[PDB]
């Protein structure tokens with residue numbers, strides 16, 4: 001079926017939970033043996049969210065190459081994304097090592113450091129120009145260059161230096177600051193505006209390594225971001241845009257990381273975002 005009318009048919013019939021459970025039942029199951037090794041317990045935020053072995057990002061280290069991060073490679077859309085958990089106190093250096101090694105231009109953050117009164121990820125970037133951060137375990141230096149605070153999101157320019165080689169690179173930090181503590185946003189308009197700002201920066205384009213996207217577990221909000229981006233790109237590329245099937249795209253993405261889209265409300269929000277976004281792309 002088309003998307004917008006499938007949408008009203010699920011709303012009128014109140015069957016979002018049943019649609020979402022079907023997706024969960026049909027989703028891929030692949031091994032995640034490296035994630036579960038005892039030496040990696042303090043590298044995982046949640047025991048039930050792990051990268052598959054076949055798609056995990058490897059750190060360029062011989063001691064321990066593990067990080068909780070996955071490469072989502074979308075062949076028809078010609079887009080790639082790295083989805084990862086919010087960094088932990090003992091993985092902030094690994095996080096920036098990955099950004100460096102994978103040649104990423106942008107980092108997309110969809111959570112606040114504290115939500116619901118608890119810490120959802122480490123404070124992993126510097127908050128003042130004159131107070132830079134040094135990650136001694138991976139030999140990197142990170143400096144805040146500029147910051148632009150808007151009503152729904154903040155964009156930061158960061159300088160990452162590889163202290164071994166003295167090479168430097170400019171990284172863009174895109175921080176969506178207004179996702180509610182509970183539920184999903186009422187309107188997708190600010191989320192779509194944010195997606196378009198990431199696109200306009202070059203961070204999603206083939207001349208750079210994959211964008212790094214995270215929330216707390218790296219599967220819910222993060223899944224919503226890449227699912228909406230890929231569906232809208234496919235609607236522009238195909239002769240028949242009404243052939244784009246958001247449930248099939250989501251199942252393809254779940255071949256590369258488990259659990260993408262965590263609730264039926266996130267599934268409905270993803271439909272809403274793609275539907276509204278497809279009208280703005282043209283008019």
Ligand SMILES: O=C(O)c1ccc(N2CCCCC2)cc1
Pocket residue numbers: 002003235236241242278279281282
């Ligand atoms: O009939 C439809 O459902 C339909 C869906 C998407 C669409 N596009 C137009 C071209 C790029 C943006 C969305 C056109 C038609």
